[PDB]
Amino acid sequence: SGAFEDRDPTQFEERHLKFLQQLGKGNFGSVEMCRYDPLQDNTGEVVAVKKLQHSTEEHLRDFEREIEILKSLQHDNIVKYKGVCYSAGRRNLKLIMEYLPYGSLRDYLQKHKERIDHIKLLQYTSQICKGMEYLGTKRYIHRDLATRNILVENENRVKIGDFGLTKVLPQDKEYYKVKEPGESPIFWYAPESLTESKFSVASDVWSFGVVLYELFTYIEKSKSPPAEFMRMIGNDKQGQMIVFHLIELLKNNGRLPRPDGCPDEIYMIMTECWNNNVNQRPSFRDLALRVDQIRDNMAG
Numbered sequence: 001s002g003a004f005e006d007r008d009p010t011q012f013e014e015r016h017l018k019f020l021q022q023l024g025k026g027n028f029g030s031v032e033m034c035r036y037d038p039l040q041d042n043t044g045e046v047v048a049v050k051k052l053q054h055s056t057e058e059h060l061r062d063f064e065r066e067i068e069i070l071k072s073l074q075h076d077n078i079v080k081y082k083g084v085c086y087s088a089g090r091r092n093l094k095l096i097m098e099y100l101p102y103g104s105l106r107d108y109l110q111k112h113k114e115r116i117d118h119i120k121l122l123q124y125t126s127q128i129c130k131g132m133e134y135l136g137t138k139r140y141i142h143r144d145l146a147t148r149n150i151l152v153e154n155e156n157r158v159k160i161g162d163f164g165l166t167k168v169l170p171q172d173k174e175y176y177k178v179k180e181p182g183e184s185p186i187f188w189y190a191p192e193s194l195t196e197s198k199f200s201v202a203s204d205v206w207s208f209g210v211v212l213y214e215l216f217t218y219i220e221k222s223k224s225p226p227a228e229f230m231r232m233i234g235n236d237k238q239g240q241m242i243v244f245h246l247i248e249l250l251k252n253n254g255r256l257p258r259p260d261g262c263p264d265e266i267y268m269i270m271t272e273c274w275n276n277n278v279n280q281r282p283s284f285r286d287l288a289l290r291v292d293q294i295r296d297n298m299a300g
Protein backbone atom coordinates (compact mmCIF):
# COMPACT_ATOMS: atom_id res chain seq x y z
CA SER A 1 0.00 0.00 0.00
CA GLY A 2 0.91 3.67 -0.51
CA ALA A 3 0.25 7.26 0.65
CA PHE A 4 -2.38 9.52 -0.96
CA GLU A 5 -2.96 13.26 -1.40
CA ASP A 6 -6.13 14.59 -3.04
CA ARG A 7 -5.58 18.19 -4.08
CA ASP A 8 -7.87 17.90 -7.09
CA PRO A 9 -11.59 17.19 -6.35
CA THR A 10 -12.34 17.74 -10.06
CA GLN A 11 -10.58 14.46 -10.90
CA PHE A 12 -12.94 11.50 -10.38
CA GLU A 13 -11.48 8.01 -9.85
CA GLU A 14 -12.90 5.63 -12.47
CA ARG A 15 -12.97 2.87 -9.84
CA HIS A 16 -15.27 4.88 -7.56
CA LEU A 17 -17.77 5.98 -10.19
CA LYS A 18 -20.68 3.56 -10.02
CA PHE A 19 -23.35 3.05 -12.65
CA LEU A 20 -26.91 3.84 -11.58
CA GLN A 21 -28.80 4.51 -14.76
CA GLN A 22 -28.65 5.33 -18.48
CA LEU A 23 -30.10 8.80 -19.22
CA GLY A 24 -29.51 9.86 -22.84
CA LYS A 25 -27.80 9.15 -26.17
CA GLY A 26 -27.61 12.13 -28.54
CA ASN A 27 -25.67 12.75 -31.72
CA PHE A 28 -22.08 12.59 -30.50
CA GLY A 29 -22.53 11.91 -26.79
CA SER A 30 -24.47 9.91 -24.25
CA VAL A 31 -25.17 10.50 -20.55
CA GLU A 32 -25.44 8.19 -17.55
CA MET A 33 -26.30 8.62 -13.90
CA CYS A 34 -23.62 7.46 -11.49
CA ARG A 35 -22.80 7.54 -7.77
CA TYR A 36 -19.35 8.68 -6.72
CA ASP A 37 -18.40 6.45 -3.81
CA PRO A 38 -14.76 6.98 -2.78
CA LEU A 39 -15.51 5.58 0.69
CA GLN A 40 -16.82 2.31 -0.76
CA ASP A 41 -19.74 2.63 1.65
CA ASN A 42 -22.43 2.34 -1.05
CA THR A 43 -23.22 6.02 -0.54
CA GLY A 44 -21.93 8.99 -2.45
CA GLU A 45 -22.97 11.97 -4.49
CA VAL A 46 -25.17 11.36 -7.52
CA VAL A 47 -23.71 12.79 -10.74
CA ALA A 48 -24.40 12.87 -14.46
CA VAL A 49 -21.58 11.51 -16.63
CA LYS A 50 -21.20 12.44 -20.29
CA LYS A 51 -19.16 10.38 -22.73
CA LEU A 52 -18.18 10.46 -26.39
CA GLN A 53 -19.31 7.76 -28.76
CA HIS A 54 -16.25 8.18 -30.96
CA SER A 55 -13.09 9.90 -29.66
CA THR A 56 -11.81 11.12 -33.02
CA GLU A 57 -9.22 13.86 -32.84
CA GLU A 58 -11.96 16.25 -33.84
CA HIS A 59 -14.60 14.91 -31.46
CA LEU A 60 -12.19 14.85 -28.52
CA ARG A 61 -10.99 18.41 -29.15
CA ASP A 62 -14.59 19.57 -29.21
CA PHE A 63 -15.36 17.66 -26.03
CA GLU A 64 -12.38 19.24 -24.25
CA ARG A 65 -13.51 22.64 -25.51
CA GLU A 66 -16.98 21.87 -24.18
CA ILE A 67 -15.58 20.88 -20.78
CA GLU A 68 -13.47 24.04 -20.45
CA ILE A 69 -16.53 26.10 -21.29
CA LEU A 70 -18.69 24.37 -18.64
CA LYS A 71 -15.92 24.55 -16.06
CA SER A 72 -15.67 28.30 -16.71
CA LEU A 73 -19.30 28.88 -15.77
CA GLN A 74 -20.58 29.38 -12.23
CA HIS A 75 -24.20 30.43 -12.09
CA ASP A 76 -27.49 29.31 -10.51
CA ASN A 77 -29.08 28.73 -13.93
CA ILE A 78 -26.21 26.87 -15.61
CA VAL A 79 -25.56 23.15 -15.14
CA LYS A 80 -22.75 22.59 -12.62
CA TYR A 81 -19.35 21.37 -13.67
CA LYS A 82 -18.03 18.79 -11.22
CA GLY A 83 -14.96 17.38 -12.93
CA VAL A 84 -13.70 14.79 -15.35
CA CYS A 85 -12.83 11.11 -15.31
CA TYR A 86 -9.97 9.62 -17.31
CA SER A 87 -11.40 6.11 -17.53
CA ALA A 88 -9.95 3.06 -19.35
CA GLY A 89 -6.64 3.50 -17.54
CA ARG A 90 -6.65 7.19 -18.33
CA ARG A 91 -7.04 6.45 -22.08
CA ASN A 92 -10.61 7.76 -22.35
CA LEU A 93 -12.37 10.89 -21.11
CA LYS A 94 -15.69 11.55 -19.40
CA LEU A 95 -17.36 14.70 -18.13
CA ILE A 96 -18.72 14.80 -14.61
CA MET A 97 -21.67 17.19 -14.07
CA GLU A 98 -24.65 17.73 -11.87
CA TYR A 99 -27.57 15.38 -12.28
CA LEU A 100 -30.93 17.09 -12.64
CA PRO A 101 -33.76 14.78 -11.46
CA TYR A 102 -36.45 16.14 -13.79
CA GLY A 103 -34.37 16.08 -16.97
CA SER A 104 -35.11 18.43 -19.85
CA LEU A 105 -37.69 21.20 -19.61
CA ARG A 106 -39.24 19.79 -22.75
CA ASP A 107 -40.02 16.44 -21.08
CA TYR A 108 -40.92 18.16 -17.84
CA LEU A 109 -43.51 20.43 -19.43
CA GLN A 110 -44.85 17.40 -21.23
CA LYS A 111 -44.85 14.97 -18.25
CA HIS A 112 -45.86 17.40 -15.50
CA LYS A 113 -48.50 19.85 -16.69
CA GLU A 114 -50.27 19.30 -13.36
CA ARG A 115 -47.45 21.28 -11.79
CA ILE A 116 -47.10 24.03 -14.36
CA ASP A 117 -48.94 27.33 -14.80
CA HIS A 118 -48.07 30.72 -16.32
CA ILE A 119 -46.34 31.92 -13.10
CA LYS A 120 -43.97 28.93 -13.37
CA LEU A 121 -43.38 29.49 -17.08
CA LEU A 122 -42.39 33.09 -16.32
CA GLN A 123 -40.08 32.01 -13.50
CA TYR A 124 -38.37 29.57 -15.90
CA THR A 125 -38.27 32.20 -18.67
CA SER A 126 -36.61 34.62 -16.27
CA GLN A 127 -34.00 32.11 -15.12
CA ILE A 128 -33.05 31.29 -18.70
CA CYS A 129 -32.51 34.95 -19.53
CA LYS A 130 -30.28 35.32 -16.48
CA GLY A 131 -28.24 32.26 -17.40
CA MET A 132 -28.01 33.73 -20.87
CA GLU A 133 -26.99 37.18 -19.52
CA TYR A 134 -24.17 35.33 -17.76
CA LEU A 135 -22.93 33.57 -20.93
CA GLY A 136 -22.73 37.01 -22.53
CA THR A 137 -20.23 38.23 -19.96
CA LYS A 138 -17.97 35.38 -21.04
CA ARG A 139 -18.71 36.25 -24.67
CA TYR A 140 -20.16 32.76 -25.21
CA ILE A 141 -22.68 32.04 -28.01
CA HIS A 142 -24.69 28.96 -27.09
CA ARG A 143 -26.11 28.30 -30.64
CA ASP A 144 -28.57 25.65 -29.48
CA LEU A 145 -31.21 27.10 -27.15
CA ALA A 146 -34.31 24.88 -26.95
CA THR A 147 -36.36 23.36 -24.10
CA ARG A 148 -34.67 20.02 -24.70
CA ASN A 149 -31.30 21.61 -23.81
CA ILE A 150 -32.62 23.25 -20.62
CA LEU A 151 -32.88 21.05 -17.54
CA VAL A 152 -35.12 21.03 -14.48
CA GLU A 153 -33.57 20.66 -11.03
CA ASN A 154 -36.95 21.10 -9.39
CA GLU A 155 -40.30 22.92 -9.63
CA ASN A 156 -38.47 26.20 -8.90
CA ARG A 157 -35.24 25.95 -10.89
CA VAL A 158 -34.06 25.33 -14.43
CA LYS A 159 -30.53 25.43 -15.82
CA ILE A 160 -29.01 25.84 -19.27
CA GLY A 161 -26.95 22.92 -20.51
CA ASP A 162 -25.86 21.48 -23.86
CA PHE A 163 -22.69 23.55 -24.28
CA GLY A 164 -21.32 21.34 -27.04
CA LEU A 165 -21.97 23.95 -29.76
CA THR A 166 -20.91 27.00 -27.79
CA LYS A 167 -18.58 29.51 -29.48
CA VAL A 168 -16.33 32.20 -27.96
CA LEU A 169 -16.40 35.69 -29.48
CA PRO A 170 -12.97 37.29 -30.02
CA GLN A 171 -12.68 40.70 -28.36
CA ASP A 172 -13.14 42.66 -31.59
CA LYS A 173 -15.96 40.68 -33.23
CA GLU A 174 -19.71 40.52 -32.65
CA TYR A 175 -20.61 37.33 -34.49
CA TYR A 176 -19.09 33.92 -35.11
CA LYS A 177 -19.47 32.42 -38.58
CA VAL A 178 -19.46 28.66 -38.31
CA LYS A 179 -19.46 26.44 -41.39
CA GLU A 180 -20.68 23.06 -40.18
CA PRO A 181 -21.48 19.65 -41.72
CA GLY A 182 -24.67 17.77 -40.95
CA GLU A 183 -28.03 18.71 -39.53
CA SER A 184 -28.96 21.94 -37.82
CA PRO A 185 -31.82 22.81 -35.42
CA ILE A 186 -33.17 24.97 -38.23
CA PHE A 187 -36.55 25.80 -36.65
CA TRP A 188 -34.75 27.50 -33.76
CA TYR A 189 -32.38 29.42 -36.06
CA ALA A 190 -32.31 33.16 -36.65
CA PRO A 191 -32.52 34.08 -40.39
CA GLU A 192 -28.86 35.17 -40.55
CA SER A 193 -27.77 31.87 -39.03
CA LEU A 194 -29.79 30.10 -41.74
CA THR A 195 -28.57 32.23 -44.63
CA GLU A 196 -25.02 33.09 -43.50
CA SER A 197 -24.11 30.73 -40.65
CA LYS A 198 -23.73 33.80 -38.48
CA PHE A 199 -24.21 33.30 -34.77
CA SER A 200 -24.24 35.95 -32.06
CA VAL A 201 -25.91 36.99 -28.82
CA ALA A 202 -28.67 38.31 -31.07
CA SER A 203 -29.16 34.93 -32.70
CA ASP A 204 -29.37 33.42 -29.19
CA VAL A 205 -32.06 35.97 -28.41
CA TRP A 206 -33.91 34.84 -31.53
CA SER A 207 -33.68 31.22 -30.38
CA PHE A 208 -34.74 32.26 -26.90
CA GLY A 209 -37.93 33.64 -28.42
CA VAL A 210 -38.60 30.18 -29.82
CA VAL A 211 -37.86 28.74 -26.36
CA LEU A 212 -40.48 31.16 -25.01
CA TYR A 213 -42.91 29.92 -27.66
CA GLU A 214 -42.28 26.30 -26.62
CA LEU A 215 -42.99 27.02 -22.96
CA PHE A 216 -46.37 28.55 -23.72
CA THR A 217 -47.33 25.68 -26.04
CA TYR A 218 -46.64 23.33 -23.14
CA ILE A 219 -45.00 21.04 -25.73
CA GLU A 220 -48.43 20.06 -27.13
CA LYS A 221 -48.50 17.45 -29.90
CA SER A 222 -49.18 19.66 -32.91
CA LYS A 223 -47.56 22.87 -31.73
CA SER A 224 -43.80 22.30 -31.73
CA PRO A 225 -41.80 24.73 -33.86
CA PRO A 226 -41.06 21.93 -36.35
CA ALA A 227 -44.72 20.86 -36.63
CA GLU A 228 -45.93 24.46 -36.99
CA PHE A 229 -43.34 25.60 -39.53
CA MET A 230 -43.94 22.42 -41.50
CA ARG A 231 -47.70 23.18 -41.63
CA MET A 232 -46.97 26.72 -42.78
CA ILE A 233 -44.40 25.46 -45.31
CA GLY A 234 -46.23 22.38 -46.55
CA ASN A 235 -45.91 19.09 -44.66
CA ASP A 236 -44.82 17.13 -47.72
CA LYS A 237 -41.70 19.14 -48.50
CA GLN A 238 -38.34 17.45 -48.10
CA GLY A 239 -34.63 18.18 -48.01
CA GLN A 240 -33.44 21.64 -48.97
CA MET A 241 -36.93 22.58 -50.11
CA ILE A 242 -37.81 22.89 -46.41
CA VAL A 243 -34.82 25.20 -45.86
CA PHE A 244 -35.55 27.32 -48.96
CA HIS A 245 -39.16 27.79 -47.82
CA LEU A 246 -38.27 28.39 -44.19
CA ILE A 247 -35.86 31.15 -45.19
CA GLU A 248 -38.22 32.81 -47.68
CA LEU A 249 -41.05 32.66 -45.10
CA LEU A 250 -39.05 34.13 -42.20
CA LYS A 251 -37.55 36.83 -44.46
CA ASN A 252 -41.07 38.09 -45.20
CA ASN A 253 -42.46 38.16 -41.66
CA GLY A 254 -43.78 34.61 -41.37
CA ARG A 255 -43.77 33.74 -37.66
CA LEU A 256 -44.90 31.03 -35.22
CA PRO A 257 -48.48 31.76 -34.14
CA ARG A 258 -49.47 32.97 -30.68
CA PRO A 259 -50.10 29.80 -28.64
CA ASP A 260 -53.59 29.24 -27.21
CA GLY A 261 -54.06 30.87 -23.82
CA CYS A 262 -50.94 32.97 -24.29
CA PRO A 263 -51.08 36.64 -23.16
CA ASP A 264 -50.52 39.21 -25.90
CA GLU A 265 -47.73 40.77 -23.84
CA ILE A 266 -45.84 37.47 -23.80
CA TYR A 267 -46.40 36.87 -27.50
CA MET A 268 -45.10 40.37 -28.14
CA ILE A 269 -41.84 39.41 -26.40
CA MET A 270 -41.47 36.48 -28.79
CA THR A 271 -42.10 38.75 -31.77
CA GLU A 272 -39.51 41.34 -30.69
CA CYS A 273 -37.00 38.51 -30.38
CA TRP A 274 -38.00 37.40 -33.85
CA ASN A 275 -36.65 40.52 -35.49
CA ASN A 276 -34.97 40.14 -38.86
CA ASN A 277 -33.01 43.21 -37.89
CA VAL A 278 -30.28 41.73 -35.66
CA ASN A 279 -29.55 44.99 -33.83
CA GLN A 280 -33.16 45.65 -32.98
CA ARG A 281 -33.63 42.46 -30.96
CA PRO A 282 -33.72 43.19 -27.22
CA SER A 283 -30.87 42.07 -24.97
CA PHE A 284 -31.19 39.28 -22.38
CA ARG A 285 -30.92 41.91 -19.63
CA ASP A 286 -33.84 43.77 -21.28
CA LEU A 287 -35.68 40.48 -21.39
CA ALA A 288 -35.10 39.44 -17.75
CA LEU A 289 -36.13 42.89 -16.46
CA ARG A 290 -39.31 42.92 -18.55
CA VAL A 291 -40.18 39.36 -17.49
CA ASP A 292 -39.48 39.96 -13.79
CA GLN A 293 -41.52 43.16 -13.97
CA ILE A 294 -44.46 41.31 -15.52
CA ARG A 295 -44.05 38.79 -12.69
CA ASP A 296 -43.72 41.44 -10.02
CA ASN A 297 -46.64 43.46 -11.33
CA MET A 298 -49.14 40.70 -10.55
CA ALA A 299 -51.30 40.97 -7.43
CA GLY A 300 -49.52 37.91 -6.09
Ligand SMILES: O=C(Nc1ccnc(NC(=O)C2CC2)c1)c1c(Cl)cccc1Cl
Pocket (backbone or CB within 6 Å): 023, 024, 025, 026, 030, 031, 048, 098, 099, 100, 101, 102, 103, 104, 148, 149, 150, 151, 161, 162
Ligand atom coordinates in the same frame (compact mmCIF):
# COMPACT_ATOMS: atom_id res chain seq x y z
O1 LIG B 1 -27.27 16.69 -20.41
C1 LIG B 1 -28.35 16.25 -20.77
N1 LIG B 1 -29.24 15.75 -19.90
C2 LIG B 1 -29.11 15.67 -18.51
C3 LIG B 1 -28.05 16.17 -17.75
C4 LIG B 1 -28.06 16.06 -16.38
N2 LIG B 1 -29.07 15.47 -15.76
C5 LIG B 1 -30.10 14.98 -16.44
N3 LIG B 1 -31.16 14.37 -15.75
C6 LIG B 1 -32.03 13.49 -16.32
O2 LIG B 1 -31.99 13.12 -17.48
C7 LIG B 1 -33.13 12.90 -15.49
C8 LIG B 1 -34.44 12.61 -16.22
C9 LIG B 1 -33.49 11.47 -15.86
C10 LIG B 1 -30.15 15.09 -17.81
C11 LIG B 1 -28.70 16.27 -22.21
C12 LIG B 1 -28.82 15.09 -22.97
CL1 LIG B 1 -28.56 13.52 -22.29
C13 LIG B 1 -29.15 15.17 -24.31
C14 LIG B 1 -29.37 16.39 -24.92
C15 LIG B 1 -29.27 17.55 -24.18
C16 LIG B 1 -28.94 17.50 -22.85
CL2 LIG B 1 -28.84 18.99 -21.96
